[PDB]
Amino acid sequence: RSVFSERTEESSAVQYFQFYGYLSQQQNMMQDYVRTGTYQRAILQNHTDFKDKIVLDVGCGSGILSFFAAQAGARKIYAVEASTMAQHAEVLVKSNNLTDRIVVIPGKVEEVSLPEQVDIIISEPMGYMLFNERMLESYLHAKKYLKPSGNMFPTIGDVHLAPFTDEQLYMEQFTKANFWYQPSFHGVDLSALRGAAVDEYFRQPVVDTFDIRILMAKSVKYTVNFLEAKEGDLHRIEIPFKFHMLHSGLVHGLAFWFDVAFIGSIMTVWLSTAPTEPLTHWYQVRCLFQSPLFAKAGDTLSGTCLLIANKRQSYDISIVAQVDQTGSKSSNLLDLKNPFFRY
Amino acid sequence: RSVFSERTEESSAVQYFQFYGYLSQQQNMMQDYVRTGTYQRAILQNHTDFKDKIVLDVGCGSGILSFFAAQAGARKIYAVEASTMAQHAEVLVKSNNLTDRIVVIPGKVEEVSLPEQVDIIISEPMGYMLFNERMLESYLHAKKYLKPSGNMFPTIGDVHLAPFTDEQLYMEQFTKANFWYQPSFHGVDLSALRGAAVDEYFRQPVVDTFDIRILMAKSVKYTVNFLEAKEGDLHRIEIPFKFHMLHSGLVHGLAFWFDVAFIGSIMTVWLSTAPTEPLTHWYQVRCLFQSPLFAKAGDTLSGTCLLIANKRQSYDISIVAQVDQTGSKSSNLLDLKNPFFRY
Amino acid sequence: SVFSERTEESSAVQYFQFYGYLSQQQNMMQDYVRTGTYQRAILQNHTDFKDKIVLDVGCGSGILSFFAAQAGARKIYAVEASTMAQHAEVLVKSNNLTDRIVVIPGKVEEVSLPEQVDIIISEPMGYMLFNERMLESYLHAKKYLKPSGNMFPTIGDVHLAPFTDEQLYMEQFTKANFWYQPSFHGVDLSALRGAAVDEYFRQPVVDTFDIRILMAKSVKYTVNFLEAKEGDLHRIEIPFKFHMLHSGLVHGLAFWFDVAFIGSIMTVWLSTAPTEPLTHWYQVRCLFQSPLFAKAGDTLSGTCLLIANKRQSYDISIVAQVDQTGSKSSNLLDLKNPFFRYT
Amino acid sequence: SVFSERTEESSAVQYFQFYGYLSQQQNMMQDYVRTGTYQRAILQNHTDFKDKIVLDVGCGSGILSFFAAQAGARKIYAVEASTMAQHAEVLVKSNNLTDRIVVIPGKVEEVSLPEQVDIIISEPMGYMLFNERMLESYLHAKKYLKPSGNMFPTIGDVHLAPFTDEQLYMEQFTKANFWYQPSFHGVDLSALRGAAVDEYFRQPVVDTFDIRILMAKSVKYTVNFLEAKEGDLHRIEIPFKFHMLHSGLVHGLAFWFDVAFIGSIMTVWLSTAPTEPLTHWYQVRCLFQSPLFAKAGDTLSGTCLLIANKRQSYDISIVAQVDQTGSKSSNLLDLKNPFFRYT
Numbered sequence A, B: 001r002s003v004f005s006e007r008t009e010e011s012s013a014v015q016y017f018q019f020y021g022y023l024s025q026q027q028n029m030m031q032d033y034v035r036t037g038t039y040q041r042a043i044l045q046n047h048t049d050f051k052d053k054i055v056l057d058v059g060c061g062s063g064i065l066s067f068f069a070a071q072a073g074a075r076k077i078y079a080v081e082a083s084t085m086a087q088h089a090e091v092l093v094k095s096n097n098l099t100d101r102i103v104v105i106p107g108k109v110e111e112v113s114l115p116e117q118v119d120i121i122i123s124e125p126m127g128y129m130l131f132n133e134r135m136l137e138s139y140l141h142a143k144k145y146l147k148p149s150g151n152m153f154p155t156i157g158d159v160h161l162a163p164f165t166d167e168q169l170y171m172e173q174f175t176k177a178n179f180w181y182q183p184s185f186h187g188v189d190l191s192a193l194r195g196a197a198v199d200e201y202f203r204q205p206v207v208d209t210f211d212i213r214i215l216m217a218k219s220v221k222y223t224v225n226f227l228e229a230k231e232g233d234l235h236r237i238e239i240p241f242k243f244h245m246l247h248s249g250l251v252h253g254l255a256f257w258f259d260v261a262f263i264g265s266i267m268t269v270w271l272s273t274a275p276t277e278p279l280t281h282w283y284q285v286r287c288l289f290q291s292p293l294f295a296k297a298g299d300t301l302s303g304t305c306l307l308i309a310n311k312r313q314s315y316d317i318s319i320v321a322q323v324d325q326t327g328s329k330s331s332n333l334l335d336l337k338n339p340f341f342r343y
Numbered sequence C, D: 001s002v003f004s005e006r007t008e009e010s011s012a013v014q015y016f017q018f019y020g021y022l023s024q025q026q027n028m029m030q031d032y033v034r035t036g037t038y039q040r041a042i043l044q045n046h047t048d049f050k051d052k053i054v055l056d057v058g059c060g061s062g063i064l065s066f067f068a069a070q071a072g073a074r075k076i077y078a079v080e081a082s083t084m085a086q087h088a089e090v091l092v093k094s095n096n097l098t099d100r101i102v103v104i105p106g107k108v109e110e111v112s113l114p115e116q117v118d119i120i121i122s123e124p125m126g127y128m129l130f131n132e133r134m135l136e137s138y139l140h141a142k143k144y145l146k147p148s149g150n151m152f153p154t155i156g157d158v159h160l161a162p163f164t165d166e167q168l169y170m171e172q173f174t175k176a177n178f179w180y181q182p183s184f185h186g187v188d189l190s191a192l193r194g195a196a197v198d199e200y201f202r203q204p205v206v207d208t209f210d211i212r213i214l215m216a217k218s219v220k221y222t223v224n225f226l227e228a229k230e231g232d233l234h235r236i237e238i239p240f241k242f243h244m245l246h247s248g249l250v251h252g253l254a255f256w257f258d259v260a261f262i263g264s265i266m267t268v269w270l271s272t273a274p275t276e277p278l279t280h281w282y283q284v285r286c287l288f289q290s291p292l293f294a295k296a297g298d299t300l301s302g303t304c305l306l307i308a309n310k311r312q313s314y315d316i317s318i319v320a321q322v323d324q325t326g327s328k329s330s331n332l333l334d335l336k337n338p339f340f341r342y343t
């Protein structure tokens, strides 16, 4: 009867936590130097926000963030982890002689019991498009243990949206669906499913990186303040947008990336996944329109990106975009849980 | 009234003979050095087939072929031309002091009267894919003026067929038809016409040249013997084919070209539009399948190319192809009258 | 009918066969300036359409009728003579507008319409505005227009300006000089050179150009579609007197056109001028047979006489003289068969 | 049901969600070797299908049922448990086969069939043949097979062979040695290097390889689907005795499989051997924890024990020893989490 079990299908949760039980996946994340190094810089440069403080690390995995908090002088760190990785974290705590300061609490943060309130919560809950995996809600849920005067690292999150043009990517996905147009595949007529196939392929967010010159307008920003937001705020996320087109051409979809800010007492440290910044394991995310929209420089592209949380720990993405001057409209549905990894 | 008028719509004939009434189009054909030079070599190298003979030039245009026949020693050349170019040809006959050997007969070869039977017929009746413009029927119809043992230049014509792979051409035509998939073009849903647009764009034979490495099998040859053929034989041309695939991959359609041979007493001279040979104003022609067929090397691709002559001086092309081992079948109907010039 | 009495059947067949292709409708719909300006003119004057009866002359795909429906018209009669009428009816059904738009297949001069309309919409402009002679169908349709009705477009302005283009003028002789050789494969072609030159100079040149070739502000000839009669377009006499801004040789006259939608809220302009973004009409240039030298400050006076023919086009007669010098030149062009020079 | 009692719910959900994607069906259909061989086997044994009753276990898109229909089958019951069943029904309708193919949505262990069948067709092979445990569904379905009924495929051969691949072996420690560093961002990771090594070696390597890495003739283990029962697949003991053709270090065992369609007219083989063209099954290699040195002429004897688990896969235990030296090696592998190494 936990909020996690009430919002998550068991099949999804089992697969999710088996995935994060593998050391190879921990290694993959740790070897993202931009992520790991920016987190260490955020915590150590703001060491006075940790010195002799009580810390909660939500989803500690291998424990790396808890060790950073220990390096910064934290009095006690409660490292919560639901996967079997919790046992490997304990091994590292002992072999690094930090048993007196890092306490691994196995289980889900929505289901464990902590012995005290904490001064600061640290976590790495960002997925693709920031919101995938629905771990932000576990991060916000954990604020029940946070002191009124407490802080959170990261403190805020910016989602950036921008229209792009990429005929090669659009053609690439259409070529895959063209298989289901065949009138005689080994003598079988498949064309009747051509519609279902296009929908399925264009339902896939494309995870990869791209040249910034494909972006056709200054990005739009949607900000989530983790200190202020509540869990329920992430069940439905409505992001309006109005782009002033800087170039003429076809808009094949919207590109997404995110920044998070660790707003400490000493300085604010940013971790960015923008295409102008060094690449991370989050790359960037692009959602294609089933049909591209034409716009000239000076036109306006308006609409809404609506994310609806589902019980598979992801979101159903509804994107409606409209060229204001012409009424040229594009509606699209995307399944954020199952992206197409193009890199 | 005449054989020509019964098989031809008046509007098509008006446009057709207006077209060839332009000196700029005659210049275009004369500056095809491969064509003009090969005809001259075929006629002069076989000067004995013209020396002191009576000649009929069907569709003399500017009269260039008649001048070649005169150079080869013909006693009398009847040059029949239906467009207003006939008056320009008469100007050239006079300025070249050949009034005693070249007699221009204004009118259609199916309607004019000649004083005598001729020893040899010369003409350039080949269009795109050999048969476009239906001038071969006029060429064969002129045999009513040919002596029993007379000759014809060209004597035979070979149509070559071969499967090709060209995903860029296929996607290019699909991209153009994709326009009619839009659900909101300026607020208007065009998708209901997607089927009709694809059918229209893929009805166009693609006229241009290509690298021979796109061909996936040795070509199949269909021979027309102009000495034996009857004009009626060209109303319905059924070309069966069986290719033995040399390469594995997608077959996007069939490529067409043609060779004509001048079989003379001294030597046989070939005029080829094959992609291995220097380019001509005929280029090559490719008929796309609406959906490509997969075949592995060693498979056989069988079917029929059916050409039905229409009243617009062209052909309706039906291509049915099948991979024998798998039953994968592809069909297409093409309108040879209105091709896509891609060069 | 009025149409059949002014049009040769062969021209009509070719004309409506041409517009029966979705690819030709698409070519015009993809002209963003044209389609976007029409939409802006109709929607920004929504009060001229809301709850009113509309006639769309030559609706083609129906796009303009859909814009009129977007503006709130109660009933739109969409008349189309080509087989595009069947595709238009499909779009009316698939956009759920059978209660508002009625497609009427046939020529506007021949069909029966039940009632008078409040506003007529159409896009009847060709090259130089008048080519295709469709404006006469537009004006003929006013027999269905209420005394207080409106016309969209309301007026049309054709612009004339002198130009200098040494390359364009010399190109005609470079092409015609192909005929000025004494032994083209042993044939003396020189007797036809003059005929070749005349043929090239009779072709208006369709393409665009740098505005810096223009030697004077254009002269404007205005057709008020609300007051004009279709008989006013059979003979169009455009007298001109250019005040030369630059000194040099005038090689001919350049043509473009504007149309204006004069609505209750605002006037919207569609321009094909070389100072504006290119459209599928490009611009048209007609050469003088001999260049005229004109000093800055001189006056270039003359007449451009457009005489309608039964090929749905015009014979163009241009006479020009330099007033200060008396230097005179003329030309007579066939607009039905222009030279497409654009690359 | 029998399925629900051998399968954890979470695994089954993920399993049938995976196969509900048209892109996954397409991936299998585009394996020409697989799809073409199945068609050959069915069509070349038309006498085993003509006017027969057929059961297709896990029809997916229905491709195999359409092959059975092409062979003249009287009635085909196509059973599919994922949402792909709804797409197969759409194809049966669009191919006008509703009189012959009855799609039954559900698990073959749970649905009810209206009659007994003459032959069962299916493609139940996973990696290493047995992965996914779908063969048990194939055998379970024999409760509907008549006493003289047939099975397509009829038998399955698993081939085991020792290999040497120094690079593959070394790659494991290169990856695991990430953890053997004393200050990863100030953290000593070395205590987990052993666990990381164990995790990597527990992964069967899926890719292809040069046949020259094989050190002996393969050993074969045959499953006769006509005679076998579901229970026979829960514990699979494969003893082996290899006679080393080459001297060197044996780093593990390579796996591949064949199936044979034993029909009345001919037997057709589908092979995934490394000597045959590649399929989407590739081959599988299981490394030994410690390599074994063997001289040409020595004997490598041991056992490969496959124990089914409720994640629809197998726990693999391999024990091998060089008979002439007594040098011994083991390994435990989890076939559910393979390393896809192919590039």
Ligand SMILES: NCCCN(CC[C@H](N)C(=O)O)C[C@H]1O[C@@H](n2cnc3c(N)ncnc32)[C@H](O)[C@@H]1O
Residues within 6 Å of the ligand: A004, A017, A020, A026, A029, A030, A058, A059, A060, A061, A062, A063, A064, A065, A080, A081, A082, A083, A085, A107, A108, A109, A110, A123, A124, A125, A126, A127, A135, A138
């Ligand atoms: N691409 C996003 C990486 C998130 N990843 C952080 C890894 C750790 N910060 C590191 O770098 O070492 C999630 C980790 O947090 C765990 N996790 C999830 N959700 C709950 C939850 N509700 N309760 C407890 N742990 C969770 C998850 O198992 C897993 O290990």
Ligand SMILES: NCCCN(CC[C@H](N)C(=O)O)C[C@H]1O[C@@H](n2cnc3c(N)ncnc32)[C@H](O)[C@@H]1O
Residues within 6 Å of the ligand: B004, B017, B020, B026, B029, B030, B058, B059, B060, B061, B062, B063, B064, B065, B080, B081, B082, B083, B085, B107, B108, B109, B110, B123, B124, B125, B126, B127, B133, B135, B138
């Ligand atoms: N690929 C074919 C085009 C070649 N074109 C010039 C050939 C000439 N030998 C040259 O090289 O200049 C044909 C010419 O033949 C004429 N032509 C057609 N059909 C009848 C016909 N039925 N009767 C008389 N002339 C014809 C046609 O007008 C036209 O000028």
Ligand SMILES: NCCCN(CC[C@H](N)C(=O)O)C[C@H]1O[C@@H](n2cnc3c(N)ncnc32)[C@H](O)[C@@H]1O
Residues within 6 Å of the ligand: C003, C016, C019, C028, C029, C057, C058, C059, C060, C061, C062, C063, C064, C079, C080, C081, C082, C084, C106, C107, C108, C109, C122, C123, C124, C125, C126, C134, C137
């Ligand atoms: N550049 C010229 C306009 C092309 N085209 C506009 C199509 C549509 N309105 C749009 O703007 O998208 C004209 C269309 O009108 C038709 N047309 C002609 N003349 C008669 C006529 N006399 N009667 C009926 N229709 C006509 C013609 O076939 C044709 O499709």
Ligand SMILES: NCCCN(CC[C@H](N)C(=O)O)C[C@H]1O[C@@H](n2cnc3c(N)ncnc32)[C@H](O)[C@@H]1O
Residues within 6 Å of the ligand: D003, D016, D019, D025, D028, D029, D057, D058, D059, D060, D061, D062, D063, D064, D079, D080, D081, D082, D084, D106, D107, D108, D109, D122, D123, D124, D125, D126, D134, D137
């Ligand atoms: N070794 C690869 C199997 C691929 N695939 C065959 C598809 C189709 N026959 C083809 O050849 O293209 C399995 C398919 O069988 C289904 N399937 C599984 N197990 C049950 C089961 N127990 N009951 C019903 N269907 C099943 C599965 O969902 C899935 O679509």
